[PDB]
Write a protein that binds this ligand. Structure first.
Ligand SMILES: [Mg+2]
Ligand SMILES: [Mg+2]
Ligand SMILES: [Mg+2]
Ligand SMILES: [Mg+2]
Ligand SMILES: [Mg+2]
Ligand SMILES: [Mg+2]
Ligand SMILES: [Mg+2]
Ligand SMILES: [Mg+2]
Ligand SMILES: [Mg+2]
Ligand SMILES: [Mg+2]
Ligand SMILES: [Mg+2]
Ligand SMILES: [Mg+2]
Ligand SMILES: [Mg+2]
Ligand SMILES: [Mg+2]
Ligand SMILES: [Mg+2]
Ligand SMILES: [Mg+2]
Lengths: 118, 186, 134, 51, 125, 147
RNA sequence: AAACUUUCAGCAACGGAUCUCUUGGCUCUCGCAUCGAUGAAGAACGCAGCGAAAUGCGAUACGUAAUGUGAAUUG
RNA sequence: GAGAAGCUCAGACGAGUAGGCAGGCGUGGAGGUUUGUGACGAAGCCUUGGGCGUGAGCCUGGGUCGAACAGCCUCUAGUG
RNA sequence: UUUCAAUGGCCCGUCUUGAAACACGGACCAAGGAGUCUAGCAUCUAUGCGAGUGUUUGGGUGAUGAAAACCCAUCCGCGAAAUGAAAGUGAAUGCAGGUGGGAACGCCCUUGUGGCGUGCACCAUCGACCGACCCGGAAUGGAAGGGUUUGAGU
RNA sequence: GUACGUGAAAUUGCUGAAAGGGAAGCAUUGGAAAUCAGUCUUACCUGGGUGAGAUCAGUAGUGCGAGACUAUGCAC
C-alpha cells in the first residue's frame, strides 16, 4: 500500500476490433498462420503476457492503497472491522437506497472507507 | 542469448498425495515434520511413499512378512515390519506366527489373524511414536510388477509378453506369426 | 472422548457457514464465527476447532462481551460449551486490562490477548457518539 | 478399560432424564468428506428422469 | 404436502384448469368469505357469490365500499358492484370489476336453493 | 463431466487438436480393423501375431458342462473346512480324520501345488493329480474317489 | 468562413436483439382396450338474432329428450 | 499466527506453428449454504464517469426499466 | 477522452516451401452455429473391499406418499492354474534356491564418496518345478532317466 | 397510445464537439483542451485553559497455597 506502480495502464484491445463492429474489444490471442500481431512485428499492437504482472505487494490496490471489498448488507461491512487499513467497502449496485444509507452509516462507525459514497 | 540445454529441469516426482483423504493428509503432516526435523532416511522414505499412487503401493500379505522376517540369517526376530500400503491375509499360511506390523491398512482377515496369534497391528502414527526414526524396523514393499499390466508391457516380436486378446483359445492369435507351420513364429 | 481438532479443521477449512470467501484480490477469506477474535480463516484462530478459544462481540448499547469456551468436558454439550462475560460500562483502560487478565494471566489464550484487545478497541470506537457535521 | 461414553436422554419437556445410552460405535467411524462427496455425487443422480 | 396420486401440483396443469374452467366450475372458484356475524349465524366460512348479494370491498382502491352484486362476469372472474364505477373520457361511468376473494358477504340473497346449499354445507338456517 | 473435458480447452484453437496439414477427415485408412494383411500389416504383425489363419480341430456343438472341472491345490485344502473343524483336528491326534469333500466346495480335481500339514485327512474328489495323491498319503491321509 | 465527409455523445428514428414470462413442446412412468353394412375413418354441403376460420351440431341442425347444478350469457 | 493448501531465504532462466499438459475466466440448469439482493426498483440495456486483473473477465457512478436475481462449496451440460 | 506532431504499422482467415498478393472466403449487424452420446478396449489416477470381489435378473420393509433410500437368498461374471490342435496331464531338492547391483535398519570405525551384517522393490543372470515337443527306453498305464528346444506358466 | 412490456446492433435525422491538400483505422511519446480523484491536519497518545462529578493505586471481607475477573465499602 506504499508507492503503487502500474507497469501499464492501457487495456490490450483485440486486433482489428477498431475496424469491425462485429469484433469485440475483449482480448483474443491471434492464431492466424500469417498473423503479424502474433509474430510481434514492429509497430503492431502488444499482446498480454506474464511479464506485465504487477508487484505482488501492490497488486489489486486502489490508488489510496486499499482494496475495494464488495458489500451487499450491513453484515458484509462488519466483516471489515479489523481490516480497516487494508479494505474499503464498495456498496453493490443492486442494494436499495434505504439499505445503502444503513451501510454508509455502519462503515462510518467502523472507520471503513467507502469507495462509492453518494 | 544463453546456450543452455535443459533435460532434467522439472522434477518428475510427486510432492503430495493425489488422494483427498483427510486422514492421509494428517499422516503426511506428521511425516513432513519428522522427515524435516530428523536426519533419518527412514522418515524420508515413509513421507515419499505416502504420496505414491495405488499401483506404486502394492499390497503385501502376512505370509510374505512372515517369510521375510524369518530367514535363517535374519535377526529380524522381534522387530516391527512397516509397509506404506495394505497388508493382506494369506489363507494358505494355516498357522500365523507372532508378528508386529505397522501398515496403512489391514484387511479384516489379516488384522484378526495377526491379533489372534498374539501379534500387534499399528497405524503409521503409532509407529512414529514407537520408532520416531524407524530404528530396528523392517521397511518392506509389495511386488510392484505383479499387476496384470506388466504381463503386457513391452509386447513385440520375440519379447514373450502377453497379447491383449478378448478370449483365450485356438482361433485367438495362435496362427500365422505364432508358429512355424503358419509362415513364421513371432 | 474426542473427535480430533485437526480433523475438524480439515473438514471445515473450505466449507463452513462462518467462512466468507471471495475470489477477488487473488482469493481472500474471512471467518465470522463468534469465537474467532482475529476474523481470519486459520486453524489456530477458529473456535470450531480449538478446545480453548475466545471471541469479542459488541454488547448493546455500550461495551463488549467476551466469549470463551468452557472446559472440554462440555464439548458435546453446546448449551454449556460457551461462556459469555459482559465487560461493559468500564472505561477503555479498565476493559483491556480485564480481557488481558481473563485470557492471558490465566494462561487460557495468551496468544490472543493482543488481537482481543484490538478487537475490543475497535468495537468501543464504533460505539462512541457520532459528532455529525451539519 | 471402561470407556463410559454415555449419552443422556431428554424428556419431552426438555429436562435431562435419568436414563443414558452408551455412545454407539458408529460415532467413532472415520469422517471422510472426500468419500462422502463421491458417494453423494452418484446417489443424487439416481432419481433422475430421462430427457 | 400432497400425497394423493390423483392430485397434480403441476403449475402448468393447475393454471390450465383454472383459466380453462367451464362456467359452472368458475362459480365455485369465485367464492367470498362470509362476514363474522354471518359465519356464526350460518356456521359457514364462505360461499360462491351470487347476483343480488350484499358485499363490502376489503382490498384495493375501493376498500370500504358496499353494495349489491349487479353481475357476476365469470368469463373474467370479476364481480360488478353497484355504485362502484369510474368515469370514462366522455363522462359515462364504467363499472370497475373486483375479485370475489377481495370482498366479504354481509347479506346473502337467500332462496330455496341457497337455503339448501347452507344445510348441505353443514350450516344452519 | 463435460466441464473438465479437453474439448472445452480447444475452443478458439481452430483445428481442435487434429492438425492443419493432416486434419480430422473421415476414415482415411478404412473402417474397423480392415487391412491387417496389407496396409495395417506392420501393426498386426507387431502387436497381434497369430491373428490370421487357422489352427486346430473344430468341435461341433460344444457343451461345456461335461467338461466342468475347476481345480484346487493342496495348499488350499485345509482352507475349505470350517474354522471349528480346523481347530478340532489340525495338529491334534484323533481317532477320526476330517473329510474334505472338494466337490461340494465347487472343485472337480485336486492338484498338487503346495504342501500339507502332517495331520490325516480324507480327500473326496472326482479327480486328483498323481503328485497331489502322493503328498496326501505322506501326510497320513487318503484320497477317496467320488462321482 | 460555410457546405461536405468522418468519429463520438445526447435526443429522435429504423429494427426487434436482450431480459423476464409461458393454458405450448419434448421426454419418462403409471393405467386402460372401445371402429365399421345397426354404414366407420375420411370427404362435401348446410345449421346461430347479428358468425367467416376453429368448436359444436344435422332440416329436431352452436341442438331435442333425460340427469345434475342452480342464475347466468356477454361484443 | 500468518488458509502448513501457510510462512520464509536464495539462484538460474523466459522465441514459438502443428501438437501436449496445467491453472484460471465466462454461460444454462441441480444439491448445500449465505437472519444473501430486490417494487424505497430484480433482470436487462445505454453511457461523452470511477476502480481491479498480464488476460479471459469483474466491480462501481449516472441514465433507462419493471419482477425477479446473486456470492461461496459441490453436481451437471444442447456452455463461449 | 479527443486531436495534433514526430517515429513505426500492408488485410484478416486459409491451404502452402512461400500470401499484402494480380490465390480463395469475407458489404453490414443481431440471434443460431461444429469432438457429442452409447457398446467396447488401453494406460494413468481416486475410492472400497481383498484371495476374493460384484446389493439394482430378482425378492422385501410397501400401505401409508415411495422411479429414491434401505434390506435380503440362490446362481452367475471376473479373479484364485497352466499347457496342448487334441485325447490329456497339471506346478517346492533347498530358507520356495544360487549369483550381482540395491531401499531401509543395525554394528564398527574415525572423520572420507566410509568398512561389516542382514537384505524389500526392481533388473540382469545360473538352476529347480508344470504343460507341449524331441529322445533313448529297461493288450494296457507311462513311472524313473534325458534334451540343443518350446509356453501369454510355477 | 393498440405501428403498444423491455427496446441492443447494423442503419438514419437533428444538435453539439472536433478533425480534414489522392483513403481511413492502430501503436509509442508528449502538447493542447475537456474531464476525474484526493476531504487530508480524521483516529490514538500527551501537554495547555476552565469546568463539574456515583472518584484512583495498596488494601478489609465474601474456592487452602499463587494468578485474572466482577461485586459491598474504605481510600474523598
Ligand atoms: Mg490495466
Ligand atoms: Mg482445418
Ligand atoms: Mg499429406
Ligand atoms: Mg514461451
Ligand atoms: Mg440447456
Ligand atoms: Mg436495476
Ligand atoms: Mg458507444
Ligand atoms: Mg494491473
Ligand atoms: Mg453447441
Ligand atoms: Mg512504414
Ligand atoms: Mg506448413
Ligand atoms: Mg495470409
Ligand atoms: Mg491455393
Ligand atoms: Mg480453393
Ligand atoms: Mg467474395
Ligand atoms: Mg451467438
Amino acid at each position: 500500500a506504499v508507492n503503487i506502480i502500474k507497469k501499464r495502464t492501457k487495456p490490450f484491445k483485440r486486433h482489428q476490433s477498431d475496424r469491425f463492429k462485429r469484433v469485440g474489444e475483449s482480448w483474443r490471442k491471434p492464431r492466424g498462420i500469417d498473423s503479424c500481431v502474433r509474430r510481434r512485428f514492429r509497430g503492431t499492437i502488444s499482446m498480454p503476457k506474464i511479464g506485465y504482472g504487477n508487484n505482488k505487494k501492490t497488486r489489486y490496490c486502489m490508488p489510496n492503497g486499499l482494496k475495494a471489498f464488495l458489500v451487499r448488507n450491513v453484515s458484509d461491512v462488519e466483516l471489515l472491522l479489523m481490516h480497516n487499513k487494508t479494505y474499503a467497502a464498495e456498496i453493490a449496485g443492486n442494494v436499495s437506497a434505504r439499505k445503502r444509507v444503513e451501510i454508509v452509516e455502519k462503515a462510518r462507525a467502523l472507520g471503513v472507507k467507502v469507495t462509492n459514497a453518494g | 542469448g544463453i546456450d543452455i540445454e535443459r533435460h532434467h529441469v522439472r522434477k518428475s516426482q510427486r510432492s503430495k498425495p493425489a488422494s483427498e483423504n483427510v486422514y492421509l493428509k494428517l499422516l503426511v503432516k506428521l511425516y513432513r515434520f519428522l522427515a524435516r526435523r530428523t536426519d533419518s532416511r527412514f522418515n524420508k522414505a515413509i513421507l515419499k511413499r505416502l504420496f505414491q499412487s495405488k499401483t506404486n503401493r502394492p499390497p503385501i500379505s502376512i505370509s510374505k512378512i512372515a517369510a521375510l522376517t524369518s530367514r535363517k540369517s535374519a535377526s529380524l526376530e522381534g522387530k516391527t515390519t512397516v509397509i506404506v500400503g495394505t497388508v493382506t491375509d494369506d489363507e494358505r499360511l494355516l498357522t500365523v506366527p507372532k508378528l508386529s506390523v505397522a501398515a496403512l491398512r489391514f484387511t479384516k482377515s489379516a488384522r484378526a489373524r495377526i491379533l489372534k496369534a498374539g501379534g500387534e497391528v499399528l497405524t503409521l502414527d503409532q509407529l512414529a511414536l514407537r520408532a520416531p526414526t524407524g530404528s530396528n524396523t523392517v521397511l518392506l514393499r509389495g511386488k510392484k510388477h505383479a499387476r496384470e499390466a506388466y504381463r503386457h508391457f513391452g509386447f513385440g516380436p520375440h519379447k514373450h509378453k502377453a497379447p491383449y486378446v478378448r478370449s483365450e483359445g485356438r482361433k485367438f492369435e495362435r496362427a500365422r506369426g505364432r508358429r512355424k507351420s503358419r509362415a513364421f513364429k513371432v | 472422548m474426542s473427535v480430533s481438532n485437526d480433523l475438524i479443521w480439515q473438514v471445515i477449512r473450505d466449507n463452513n457457514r462462518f467462512l466468507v470467501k471471495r475470489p477477488e484480490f487473488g482469493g481472500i477469506q474471512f471467518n465470522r464465527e463468534p469465537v474467532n477474535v482475529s476474523g481470519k480463516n486459520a486453524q489456530r484462530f477458529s473456535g470450531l476447532c480449538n478446545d480453548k478459544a475466545v471471541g469479542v462481540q459488541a454488547n448493546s448499547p455500550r461495551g463488549v462481551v467476551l466469549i470463551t469456551k468452557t472446559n472440554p468436558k462440555n464439548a458435546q454439550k453446546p448449551a454449556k460449551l460457551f461462556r459469555k462475560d459482559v465487560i461493559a460500562n468500564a472505561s477503555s483502560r479498565k476493559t483491556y486490562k480485564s480481557i488481558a487478565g481473563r485470557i492471558g494471566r490465566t494462561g487460557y489464550r495468551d496468544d490472543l490477548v493482543k488481537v482481543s484487545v484490538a478487537r475490543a478497541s475497535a468495537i468501543l470506537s464504533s460505539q462512541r457518539p457520532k459528532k455529525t457535521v451539519a | 478399560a471402561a470407556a463410559r461414553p454415555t449419552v443422556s436422554i431428554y424428556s419431552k419437556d426438555g429436562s435431562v432424564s435419568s436414563e443414558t445410552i452408551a455412545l454407539p460405535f458408529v460415532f467413532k467411524a472415520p469422517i471422510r468428506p472426500d468419500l462422502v462427496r463421491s458417494v453423494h455425487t452418484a446417489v443424487a443422480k439416481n432419481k433422475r428422469q430421462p430427457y | 404436502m400432497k400425497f394423493s396420486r390423483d392430485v397434480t401440483s403441476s403449475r402448468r396443469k393447475q393454471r390450465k384448469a383454472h383459466f380453462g374452467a367451464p362456467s359452472s366450475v368458475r362459480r365455485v372458484l369465485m367464492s367470498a368469505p362470509l362476514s363474522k356475524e354471518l359465519r356464526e349465524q350460518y356456521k359457514i366460512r364462505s360461499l360462491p357469490v351470487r347476483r343480488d348479494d350484499q358485499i363490502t370491498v376489503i382490498r384495493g382502491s375501493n376498500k370500504g365500499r358496499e353494495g349489491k352484486i349487479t353481475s357476476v362476469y365469470r368469463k373474467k372472474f370479476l364481480l360488478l358492484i353497484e355504485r362502484v364505477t369510474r368515469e370514462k373520457a366522455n363522462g359515462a361511468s364504467a363499472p370497475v370489476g373486483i375479485d370475489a376473494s377481495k370482498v366479504v358477504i354481509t347479506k346473502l340473497h337467500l332462496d330455496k336453493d341457497r337455503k339448501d346449499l347452507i344445510v348441505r354445507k353443514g350450516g344452519k338456517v | 463431466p463435460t466441464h473438465t473435458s479437453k474439448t472445452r480447452k480447444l475452443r478458439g484453437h481452430v483445428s481442435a487438436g487434429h492438425g492443419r496439414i493432416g486434419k480430422h477427415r473421415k476414415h482415411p485408412g478404412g473402417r474397423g480393423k480392415a487391412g491387417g494383411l496389407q496396409h495395417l500389416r506392420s501393426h498386426f504383425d507387431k502387436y497381434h501375431p497369430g491373428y490370421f489363419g487357422k489352427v486346430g480341430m473344430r468341435r461341433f456343438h460344444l457343451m461345456k458342462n461335461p467338461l466342468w472341472r475347476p481345480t484346487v491345490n493342496l495348499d488350499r485344502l485345509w482352507t475349505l473346512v470350517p474354522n471349528e473343524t480346523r481347530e478340532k483336528y489340525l495338529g491334534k491326534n484323533t481317532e477320526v480324520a476330517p473329510v474334505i469333500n472338494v466337490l461340494q466346495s465347487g472343485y472337480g480335481k485336486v492338484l498338487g501345488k503346495g504342501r500339507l500339514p502332517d495331520t490325516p485327512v480324507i480327500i473326496q474328489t472326482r479327480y486328483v493329480s498323481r503328485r497331489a495323491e502322493e503328498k496326501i498319503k505322506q501326510a497320513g491321509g487318503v484320497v477317496e474317489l467320488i462321482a
